[PDB]
Amino acid sequence: GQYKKLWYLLFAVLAVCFTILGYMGSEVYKKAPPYPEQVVSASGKVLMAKDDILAGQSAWQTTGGMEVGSVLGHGAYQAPDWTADWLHRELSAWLDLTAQQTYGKKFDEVSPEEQAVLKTRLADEYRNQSRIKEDGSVVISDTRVKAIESILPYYHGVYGDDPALQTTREHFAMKNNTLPSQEAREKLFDFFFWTSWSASTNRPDETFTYTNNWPHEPLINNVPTTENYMWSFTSVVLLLMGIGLLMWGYSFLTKHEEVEVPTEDPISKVQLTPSQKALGKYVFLTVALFVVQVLLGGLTAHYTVEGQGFEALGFEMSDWFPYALTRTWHIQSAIFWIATGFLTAGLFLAPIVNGGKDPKFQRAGVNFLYIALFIVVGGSYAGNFFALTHILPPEFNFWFGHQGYEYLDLGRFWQLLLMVGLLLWLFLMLRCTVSAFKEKGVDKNLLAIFVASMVGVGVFYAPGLFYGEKSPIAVMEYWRWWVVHLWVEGFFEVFATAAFAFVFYNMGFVRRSTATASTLAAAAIFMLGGVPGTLHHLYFSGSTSASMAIGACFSALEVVPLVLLGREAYEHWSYQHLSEWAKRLRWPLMCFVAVAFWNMIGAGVFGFLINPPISLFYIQGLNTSAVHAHAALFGVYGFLALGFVLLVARYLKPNVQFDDKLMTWGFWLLNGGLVGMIAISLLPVGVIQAYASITHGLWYARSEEFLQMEILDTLRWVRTAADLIFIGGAICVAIQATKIV
Amino acid sequence: GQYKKLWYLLFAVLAVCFTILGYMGSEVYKKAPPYPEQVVSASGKVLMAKDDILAGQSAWQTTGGMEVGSVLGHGAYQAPDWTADWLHRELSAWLDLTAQQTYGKKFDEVSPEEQAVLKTRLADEYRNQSRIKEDGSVVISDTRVKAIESILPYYHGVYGDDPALQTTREHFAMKNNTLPSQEAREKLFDFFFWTSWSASTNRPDETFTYTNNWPHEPLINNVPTTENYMWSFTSVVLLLMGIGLLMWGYSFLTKHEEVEVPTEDPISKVQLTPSQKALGKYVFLTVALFVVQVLLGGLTAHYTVEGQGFEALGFEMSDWFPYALTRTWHIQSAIFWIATGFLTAGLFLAPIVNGGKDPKFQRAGVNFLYIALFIVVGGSYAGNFFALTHILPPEFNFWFGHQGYEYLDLGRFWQLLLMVGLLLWLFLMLRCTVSAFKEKGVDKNLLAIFVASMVGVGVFYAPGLFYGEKSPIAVMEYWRWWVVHLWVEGFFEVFATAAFAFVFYNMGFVRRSTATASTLAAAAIFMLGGVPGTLHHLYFSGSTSASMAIGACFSALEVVPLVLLGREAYEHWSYQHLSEWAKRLRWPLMCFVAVAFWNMIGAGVFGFLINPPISLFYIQGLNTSAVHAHAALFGVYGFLALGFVLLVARYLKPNVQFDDKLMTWGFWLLNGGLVGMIAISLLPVGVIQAYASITHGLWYARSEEFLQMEILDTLRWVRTAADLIFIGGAICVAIQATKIV
Ligand code: HEM
Ligand code: HEM
Ligand code: HEM
Ligand code: HEM
Ligand SMILES: [Ca+2]
Ligand SMILES: [Ca+2]
Ligand SMILES: [Fe+3]
Ligand SMILES: [Fe+3]
């Protein structure tokens, strides 16, 4: 139509960004750290062939995966980082062995000059002993073989049953036999060794490791590279130059037009079809998983202060429901109820778009989608419970058990079933619009972008597939962030914006041109830095030095739209003071004003704190990622889902009022709990934990005696005072939404 | 009045910030690096007592001061940094002497292990050999005495006459006998030694030097401290949290009111008093110094590519007008014409405020101020010329010669004379308002803030005094930035804002309440981060570690108002499309739209690039400070001064039109030259020079062979293509402003 410039600008953004992203994925396949054919000692004692590295990667997913610790930065934050911990134990062992056969003392009775000699001899057998080319063989001296063999007792004790290594499994919140089979418990440490090898060995040509000198290890001069500084001083310039240049466009290209609303609620005139009346059970589920998901959060936060249970009447608590299991359930349920809220908010708009009716048997397909959703959520949680007690045979662990990679913890069978359910939902949504496209009216522009976003949110769960059980780590780390970063942080902020404009145009709150030109210009800024910014999750996990130059500069244009979001929060807050009928949809509009607030304090202020490559170097794997996780995820998409189901509750029982005094408590208790469990517990621990990782190293900030310090312990204990408030607010909102329906 | 909350908020900001600033100045006096009583060798050979350090600091100001090089970071950018250069030469000499008496090789035939031993022995005689307490004595080993004595030939040759050290004085753009007296040329190197001593010696209690580990020197582990990282990750959070939270206030607390203008130019009805007609010679001077100041800029940029002259018919060019002299004149003239523009813009408003008349002998005072200004500008430039040829006796050098500290280069006599002239100007301005205060009308609120800013800009040149010739360096470095940072970057952005609101309220463009509540709320944000942010100029010059925590976090609230400045650029640009009489004052309003643009790209984007303590660590003293200097200073205050004198030109000859086609060239040539000499010459050199200082050290990025690299030489040569454009634009604007009057 007349928006032909705004459509071309959007097609030109998608073409150039999906090539920067696709080309840098063609290099992850051919520049990732390789699995060496053999790791031979210097003498010739072959040790740890590659198929044992793969058997250890498979044995790692049966222990809980990234939910029990963290490997190469990604994982949980209670047990240490196994790469940065193995590396330091092996380095200190090598040093204490070489200091004995040279001077006769244990590296600490040794004077600083000889400490310098020993350290400059250490960081040359680790760094410049790369993978031999023309054959995947890695040659290791005979002191490094004795250093590895002397630290294996500790790890056998921490992952197995050992009366000596109690009080260290309780501090890591680990069940006793995390990996019972001692035959597989030794192949897992081959995988741990390989991960610490790729993190301390120079690339075949450069002077930095395969992980860009990650993590911080002063013993071998693991420090930020030079372009690590340059590309981090550059992204700040791009951010500050785009913030004030978009505020310059907003002030010259926006006239603040004025509209008069209709007299009576133009959506409350369309009577409910038989399919829209089926959506009553979809609303109760979006706030039932929400209360189940928040209880599991307070139940997994209990293991971080005690490590054991309360239930001295029955079984062992930490044997069937350990920290890994409750953490997996508490992370997975946060995706299900959010996605359910978006699904029901779409399925409500579908029949209204088709004039006023349902084309065929929508009520049958809607009920089928409901049943499939329950099958997925139930079978996934049953497979997670069996795959951690090791009742399930280990060969069926990747397909029906626990994948071991967070945000994709459900087995592959349930993953395929969920993808099929998503395709069915997309089919229904698209089926209820082909009559609105085929029409001799004018301006189907605002409807085309809407169905574009509908397709996007339903299709981009497929990249979670095409990575197998035995594929390299750096490859799944690249396809996992196509569904966690791209399908959520960049495709849900287009569906939500288009749904805002569509809904608020049908209710006569905005003009036809203002709602289709501002949405179509906000769908380009959300993909200019959203698509190639995927690579800010792959800095230090096996990607080249150009990945952290592309992801650092593009994800800075990803904060530019978010901090100027007080402009749309005033528009949504004023819509309620326009009529006496628009004052009924007040609490739905009040959640959309909170979405805009947390989209700039959670995803823009605390999201850019950890974005630059030099900040994330010392910070990856600490409690600031959890600040950002809770703030961004809930504050944005949780309030989005709650507002959507509260707006669907209304118009579905248009005879029940909203009980202001129950929602004034529910709203502010949620908003006061989220700020409570950030400003008094999460952020102080993250800042004390950041100071230690800059002076000493990541091995220290995550160690057992550092997390138990009588200050970090009375600080993750005070978090409970701010979590009961949050649970109360969730209870209030759930009670209200159930009373309505 | 009714703005009693906005006045109290402003008094509460001034009270708390001027105590943070005053308390951190009470510590500069008692924590600065001290002048040691004696510097005795180990044996007992006393060397370089403190009065010789002071005699060398005095002898340093007679060589040009900070205009010939840079000491401790502050200065010019053609000759090296003398602290970071002396330090590295002495360290490498010490190493090559100790490597001879230990192994017999010159530290480069020496294997890496012995290089580690030598380096860990070097960075313990330099760091942990602090000032002996209870008496100001510093004990130096006998190798460090032989290392100092072996590098003095090079410096005697560079500051004196030596046929061998030609082609190194031409590369530094230095006249031959920069310091002729060999008796004083040796006491200056005592001052150089002391500055490199304070930069490589731990504080009496801490593990960092007196200059917070500056400069970057890998030989002695001069690297950023840990709180250097923490307070730099914190200021970014404050910046991003204030940007989006003020945009949230602007959107909820501003209604976009509408006003109707009067029918005819309410200021063009007041007839000109005999004093306002004297301001015709003030306008010609503001654009005569502007063309003289821009020519000296292109004349001092000529020494950076050749080092000598063109004038083979007369004398020696680089003997009477060296690089130091033209640089001093080109920096000092930029303050005079800017201040002159502000002065005349004030003296024009003074009689209009007094109803319509002049109280007493006002025109006599105006002519007296003119004569005093010419005496100052002439005597200063005469004293600078004589004090560099060493014709003036050296005892009268601080009072009538060259102070040696940039932005305060004029002698102290002319400084006192300028302060007296400023007090007289303030007297006139305040005298023409006592009848407008004494009145039984209402709402003298918008007039009180105006005279407040008038007092501020005239009084705060006094802190440039109370520092003497022999006061410690860290003390003058603290009083110099009370007039360069506070009296300009924080007191001229209040006078200009108040003058905007006052003028545009008298012409009926804004409401009475909108102009006195937004100005009074913008006078508090410009002092919340403007007053304590002074300390971001004192990071690495002798201040404690708390100064770079206070200045880093407060100067981040100093960018918050500047990036959201596209909001006031649309208001000023629209005022011209309101009448056929308001369309005459178009080019004055067009400069105020450029002031707002450069106040966010020059002072907000490139100003925060070098603000954080970890950015400035590797960057202080490079060509990014010049990018920021030109962009900020001209782009903001130059366009302010030009717009003020173009608005005073009109209303002073209300019969001459503005010749659009001459101002369309003048405006865009200036705006295209400023972007030209930044994006093609200054910024590329600064970025290539930043990369070298992060890998090697500041001694390398500033060295002679690095600045002569056939790429940095064909890049400061291409700058001339973008400077002739700027000179052309200045010529156009000057021609127009002279044609008017
Ligand atoms: C009382 C309420 C809550 C409590 C006590 C809580 C507690 C926790 C705990 C203990 C963890 C794991 C920390 C670790 O691995 O050491 C976590 C992680 C997480 N929680 Fe919550 N949570 C709560 C509410 C929520 C809500 C409402 C959401 C909504 C999406 C949510 C989403 C997440 C996510 C995404 C993570 C993963 C963080 C990461 O992997 O870095 N949580 N939470
Ligand atoms: C808008 C909604 C957003 C959501 C829901 C979200 C969610 C998350 C979550 C849950 C994590 C934790 C991943 C993990 O534990 O492995 C994460 C990581 C991260 N986020 Fe986002 N995010 C959002 C926006 C942003 C934005 C705009 C930025 C801009 C810089 C950003 C920067 C980062 C970075 C650098 C990480 C990596 C942290 C780490 O790996 O420890 N996020 N995000
Ligand atoms: C064609 C126009 C100009 C040229 C070629 C020019 C050139 C230069 C040069 C060569 C320097 C010294 C660089 C060094 O020390 O190595 C300098 C510094 C400076 N110029 Fe300009 N300049 C021009 C215009 C201006 C204008 C219009 C202003 C208005 C205020 C200005 C203000 C300054 C200031 C404040 C400095 C000090 C920079 C510092 O100390 O870091 N210049 N300029
Ligand atoms: C608004 C008008 C401003 C003007 C006219 C201005 C002017 C200047 C000038 C000429 C310099 C060079 C000083 C020297 O060579 O020693 C400088 C330094 C500096 N400016 Fe500003 N500035 C302004 C605003 C700002 C702001 C808002 C910031 C915010 C961070 C800032 C940050 C800095 C820093 C950190 C330095 C030190 C650079 C160095 O010492 O090399 N400036 N300023
Ligand atoms: Ca995680
Ligand atoms: Ca300077
Ligand atoms: Fe992301
Ligand atoms: Fe400043």
Author numbering:
A (entry chain A), B (entry chain B): 2 to 311, 316 to 746
Which sentences from the paper describe this structure?
A quinol-dependent nitric oxide reductase (qNOR) plays a critical role in the survival of the bacterium in the human host by combatting the host’s immune response. qNORs belong to the broader family of nitric oxide reductases (NORs). NORs are largely found as the essential component of anaerobic nitrate respiration, also known as denitrification, in the bacterial cytoplasmic membrane and catalyse the reduction of nitric oxide (NO) to nitrous oxide (N2O). Whilst cNORs are pre­dominantly found in denitrifying organisms as a respiratory enzyme, qNORs are also found in several pathogenic bacteria, including the Gram-negative, human-pathogenic bacterium N. meningitidis, as an enzyme that is responsible for the detoxification of NO produced by the host. High-resolution structure determination of N. meningitidis qNOR (NmqNOR) is of importance to provide a framework for developing a knowledge-based strategy for the design of new antibacterial agents, as well as to help to understand the chemistry of NO reduction, 2NO + 2 H+ + 2e− → N2O + H2O, at the heme and nonheme iron (FeB) binuclear centre.
For the final 3D reconstruction with C2 symmetry imposed, a final global resolution of 3.06 Å was achieved, as judged by the ‘gold standard’ FSC = 0.143. 3, FeB and their associated ligands could be modelled with confidence. The coordination of the active site in the absence of zinc was observed by cryo-EM, which interestingly showed that FeB was ligated by four ligands: the three conserved histidine ligands (His490, His541 and His542) and Glu494 [Fig. 4(a)]. The dimeric structure of NmqNOR is largely maintained by TMII, similar to as in AxqNOR. Along TMII, structural analysis using PyMOL (version 1.8; Schrödinger) revealed a cavity that bridges the dimeric interface connecting the two monomers [Supplementary Figs. S5(b) and S5(c)]. At the end of this putative water channel lie Glu498 and Asn604, which are ligated and may serve as a ‘junction’ that is responsible for controlling the proton before entering the active site; our previous study shows that mutation of Glu498 reduces the activity of this enzyme. For the crystal structure, the crystal was grown under zinc-containing conditions, which led to the observation of three zinc-binding sites, with the Zn2 binding site affecting the conformation of Glu494. However, a native dimeric structure was observed in the cryo-EM structure as the data were collected without any additional buffer components; in this structure Glu494 was ligated to FeB, which we believe is the natural position for Glu494 [Fig. 6(a)].
